[PDB]
Symmetry: D3
Subunit: 133 residues, 6 copies
């Protein structure tokens, strides 16, 4: 299949409570954790906002109505990093995997934008998902 974009038909599916949790990391130098925590709130909003626009960022995703989005951030001085864990949930025909992965990635991008001045090079990753319902 060359040059084609097919969107999966979800009409036939049942309405179920679906759920997904992803995680993402922003690794940096130890000092670069000079930390205000509303720096996290900016990143927290960015993930929630990204989660709600996922159908618009990912070309083949469905418009969905999220029941809840939560974005948590943790600083791990022992590992030189910020840990993010996301949670998206709805009751519909479509899972919320991409929403969580997007919400974690953009929260990660946001922290990079906030600290980009101190360290030119920081490493975002890994980005993956813990479990889904």
């Amino acid at each position: 299949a060359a040059g084609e974009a097919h969107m999966v038909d979800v009409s036939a599916k049942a309405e179920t409570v679906r759920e997904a949790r992803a995680e993402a990391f922003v690794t940096m130098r130890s000092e670069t954790l000079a930390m205000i925590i509303d720096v996290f709130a900016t990143a927290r909003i960015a993930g929630i906002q990204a989660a709600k626009r996922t159908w618009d960022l990912i070309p083949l995703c469905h418009p969905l109505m999220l029941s809840k989005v939560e974005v948590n951030l943790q600083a791990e001085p022992e590992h030189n990093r910020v840990r993010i864990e996301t949670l998206c949930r709805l009751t519909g025909k479509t899972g919320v995997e991409m929403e969580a992965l997007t919400a974690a990635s953009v929260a990660a991008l946001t922290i990079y934008d906030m600290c980009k001045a101190v360290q030119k090079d920081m490493v975002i990753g890994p980005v993956r998902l813990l479990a889904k319902s």
Copy 2:
């Protein structure tokens, strides 16, 4: 020394004073998967379609919404965007390399990273029916130009 105000609060830094130079930034991303997961990409056997073309466009579009995605960034006019997708069977991964350039007052690290991130999120969306536990990463910056701040390479 941040994207934050003097008080512990969020504002938008005034960039107007600085010099307007041609700026550039290149970033990279990796999508780690199974050998079988990468093999259906080369064969075009994922039911969702052309995975690289879709990830190419998505990142390009992602690039232009960066100021709109990253809450505090300045609106910018990208002059050039390149999103490169490459298959690496030997490491079980797709390597992604992006390139953003414009003539403005504020840097372009975020546009290049964002383009790289969504191309990765897209490649994931396109193949996730086959493998649910793929790993996105690392996401890094490879170079930056035009900035008054410390320029950077490799």
Copy 3:
């Protein structure tokens, strides 16, 4: 200052799917001459304010960080000239069948229509005032 840097979105999967409704209002006070500009010399002006408020309401989830994305079933925005008060009254109506109310949509519809009217008359009068913006009714 507890809960600092924190952003919780209320969970709504537990609520019942019912028809929910919200009415909001807004006023834009101006000089009488500015209010005479619209009525005497109103369609192109009220329409812009009408449309802007309707599309704005359809974007409330994009504007209010912690609001739910919902699918609006009806959006009505009426504009009224009130010469006795040197002002323009806006009244909006939002309604759908879902788990989330449509309060913010109705409020946003009113706010943006207000801002739209402000932009339209901004050249004639510098010091126009928007307010009050308050909610009129809710059913849910």
Copy 4:
């Protein structure tokens, strides 16, 4: 309550122009892929483009592109489908129009007087 709608659009050009889409096999490459992605994206934003439309939860968006050298044009056909309270006509026409516009943008450099139309429901 499965509802469905299909639209179509044409982007008429010179036979020389339509050959740049196929003699580089771009037609089953990125050029058609872009118009296909654009139209799908546009269809999911019909409510944001057309003032009096409702936001809808689409079950499917299809954008098929086919070259008709025989008529000097690219034929476009769209398909929108959902299970809900609102038909999806505007979504199909929007997907159809924007998908045609992307193709104009692609070949805009080659020909300055390309013509889009007709755009109609099926």
Copy 5:
């Protein structure tokens, strides 16, 4: 072409080009039955003022051209005009738009998008009455960018 030698899709760097006042005119048509055209004129379509609704829809679609059309450059429009006119002799509505800015890349897509989106809107207003409407033709009338046309 507007894509890569690779056959890859990319956005071309146009920064080297001069910063000139570019302009674009496009026209578009929406053919309907005579009664449907008259309900626009009498303003008896229940949704509301069709031309005014379409005008605004077109203006705003123009400001979103780079965000709708995937490979186009982000631009800052200086002026957008959206003109609506009924032509009873042809059973149709004629749309004529105007875009212009001081930039390094043209504004054709901005005018064409405005014409199509004003046309989609006119369709959406009158759709309840008629499902037979045909949009077209949609074409470019002029360009005075740095890359002259008419």
Copy 6:
């Protein structure tokens, strides 16, 4: 021609200051300071929200021009004595177009967020007044 042809105007430093108020009951203004509003950090969310709104003004107000902002600041300040939150925004850029709508939209969406963050507690909060404080680019203040 209701969308004004902004080119060609002089490229000048343009600035705008706007203000807005969200009146509430003292328990509501108290749970903001306590930060016992369930949705979260109210001022942060309203501060971020107002800022993005400034960058989206061109897309919300039909006849406004697309522009590129340089500075957006959103001030939230609690006024227990007046049972209200005062918002003051400041928008600046260098271009051909003024920034009044941005400052006003930012102030308005920040107000709308504050309403969103506290509305579970109080349904009858009242947003107003929303006005311009200053624009520089002739000049105006007061």
